[PDB]
Every structure is written in C-alpha cells, then in structure tokens.
From Swiss-Prot, chain A:
Residues 5-69 form the KH domain. It comes from Homo sapiens (Human). There is a cross-link at residue 40 (Glycyl lysine isopeptide (Lys-Gly) (interchain with G-Cter in SUMO)). The modification N6-acetyllysine is found at residue 23. Identified in the spliceosome C complex. Part of a transcription inhibitory ribonucleoprotein complex composed at least of the circular RNA circZNF827, ZNF827 and HNRNPL. Interacts with RBM42 and ZIK1. Interacts with BRDT. Interacts with ANKRD28. Interacts with ASFV p30 protein. Interacts with DDX1. Interacts with MDM2; this interaction leads to ubiquitination and proteasomal degradation. Interacts with p53/TP53. Interacts with IVNS1ABP (via BACK domain); the interaction is direct. Interacts with PPIA/CYPA. (Microbial infection) Interacts with HCV core protein. There is a cross-link at residues 23, 40 (Glycyl lysine isopeptide (Lys-Gly) (interchain with G-Cter in SUMO2)). The modification Phosphoserine is found at residue 38. This is Heterogeneous nuclear ribonucleoprotein K. It is found in: Cytoplasm; Nucleus, Nucleoplasm; Cell projection, Podosome.
UniProtKB/Swiss-Prot annotation, chain B:
The lineage of its organism: Eukaryota, Metazoa, Chordata, Craniata, Vertebrata. This is Heterogeneous nuclear ribonucleoprotein K. The chain holds residues 385 to 457 of 463 of the full protein. There is a cross-link at residues 23, 40 (Glycyl lysine isopeptide (Lys-Gly) (interchain with G-Cter in SUMO2)). Sequence repeats lie at residues 17-39, 22-25. It is found in: Cytoplasm; Nucleus, Nucleoplasm; Cell projection, Podosome. It is linked to Au-Kline syndrome: A disorder characterized by intellectual disability, facial dysmorphism, cardiac defects, and connective tissue and skeletal abnormalities. Dysmorphic features include long palpebral fissures, ptosis, a broad prominent nasal bridge, hypoplastic alae nasi, an open downturned mouth, ears with underdeveloped and thick helices, high palate, and a unique tongue with a prominent median crease. Hypotonia, hyporeflexia, and high pain tolerance are additional features. There is a cross-link at residue 40 (Glycyl lysine isopeptide (Lys-Gly) (interchain with G-Cter in SUMO)). One of the major pre-mRNA-binding proteins. Binds tenaciously to poly(C) sequences. Likely to play a role in the nuclear metabolism of hnRNAs, particularly for pre-mRNAs that contain cytidine-rich sequences. Can also bind poly(C) single-stranded DNA. Plays an important role in p53/TP53 response to DNA damage, acting at the level of both transcription activation and repression. When sumoylated, acts as a transcriptional coactivator of p53/TP53, playing a role in p21/CDKN1A and 14-3-3 sigma/SFN induction. The modification N6-acetyllysine is found at residue 23. Induction: By DNA damage, including ionizing radiations and phleomycin treatment or UV irradiation. This induction requires ATM kinase activity (ionizing radiations and phleomycin) or ATR activity (UV irradiation). Up-regulation is due to protein stabilization. Constitutive protein levels are controlled by MDM2-mediated ubiquitination and degradation via the proteasome pathway. Identified in the spliceosome C complex. Part of a transcription inhibitory ribonucleoprotein complex composed at least of the circular RNA circZNF827, ZNF827 and HNRNPL. Interacts with RBM42 and ZIK1. Interacts with BRDT. Interacts with ANKRD28. Interacts with ASFV p30 protein. Interacts with DDX1. Interacts with MDM2; this interaction leads to ubiquitination and proteasomal degradation. Interacts with p53/TP53. Interacts with IVNS1ABP (via BACK domain); the interaction is direct. Interacts with PPIA/CYPA. (Microbial infection) Interacts with HCV core protein. It comes from the Eukaryota.
Amino acid sequence: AMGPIITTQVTIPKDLAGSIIGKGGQRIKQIRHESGASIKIDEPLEGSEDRIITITGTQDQIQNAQYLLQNSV
Amino acid sequence: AMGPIITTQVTIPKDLAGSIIGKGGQRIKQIRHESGASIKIDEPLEGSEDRIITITGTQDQIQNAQYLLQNSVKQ
Amino acid sequence: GAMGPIITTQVTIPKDLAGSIIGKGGQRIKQIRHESGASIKIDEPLEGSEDRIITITGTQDQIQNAQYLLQNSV
DNA sequence: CCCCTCCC
C-alpha cells in the first residue's frame, strides 16, 4: 500500500547544504530519482543559518528520501 | 574541447562586492550556475579596500564568469 | 600608486610555443620574472594534451607586466 | 546586497 502523498519539511544548517546537493547538483538529483520523492531545498532565509528542505511523496518515499539525505551528510 | 581547469584571481574594491554577491548571495549563485565556473570571493582582508575573487574552470567558463561579473557591477 | 594583494593567474599555451617563452638556457623566462617582478612557472604538458599551464603570481601590475612580456616573447 | 559542492 502506497497511501497518500504527504509533505514533510526539515531544516539543515546552511553550511551542510552542499553535501546534500553535490557538485553540479548530482547528489540531490540522485536522491530524487532513487527515493521517488520530490525534494525541494529553499534558499537560506533572511540572514539565517537554516535552510528548509521540503520532501513530498508517499510515506515510504519520504522515509527513503530521509535516509538518502542522511547518507549524503 | 573544454581544455584544462585553471584558476584566475582578480580583485574588486570592497565597496563593490555587494553588487556581485547580491541579497542572500543570489547574484553570485547565478554567476556560478551560468558560467559553470567556481567563484570564490574572499573576506575583506585585514586593513585594506581590496577583495580577492578566485575563478576556477575552463578558459571559456572563466571568460563567461568575467563577463557576468562585469555585468553585475556595470548594471 | 597602490600595489594591492599578490594574486595568482593561470593561462595555457600551446606546447609547441613554450620554447619562445623560455629561451635557450631558460634565459627569456628568467628575464621575464626579473623584469616584471612576477613569479612565473610553466608546467610540464598534461597527458594527452597540447596545452601547458603558466602560473603567474604577483600584484596586478606585475601580472599585467608579465602578460605583456610573455606576449612579446611569442 | 555577504554567498560558498547550489540542484529544481
């Protein structure tokens, strides 16, 4: 059972965002295709050190994506 | 034919660095993406009004980057 | 009227052209470094390639001086 | 205008 598409957000220290994205964005593109989740990384907010990541998919896809995001860091 | 990855440095007056970087760094992000060069702007340094920019890529990337840098300041 | 930071610039040259920069017994390049005051290093050609990288280190003036002298060599 | 493996 897939269940519904849901959206989850988390923040990431901006210092660490390059690890999830990777040179030429390869690593995030890989995370999106492997997990099947939509993954958005916002620009860092106004004078702040947090960057919001939005993950959208079934619960499994989102749990898949959270692991792949962890393994990146 | 891309050729070797090389590094060039130039300086800018520190009072011009804002035009290049942009609010929340958006302009410089755009310049890196578009030229495909790595572009690093150093902090202040200590005492002086010059700020070093390091550009790394193929010769075309670096030339592409130098135009986009100039386009940021001029306009 | 103000020298500024020592900075580094690289440019490539066709390998077939490097003899002109160097001179017999490395004398033209020696002359280029003393003249401009820039430090100038020419790498060995990278594998499978026609290009040699030249690294010039100095202030902006020294580097521009060196870039002219390199050009006048060719 | 202050970013920084920078993707969409």
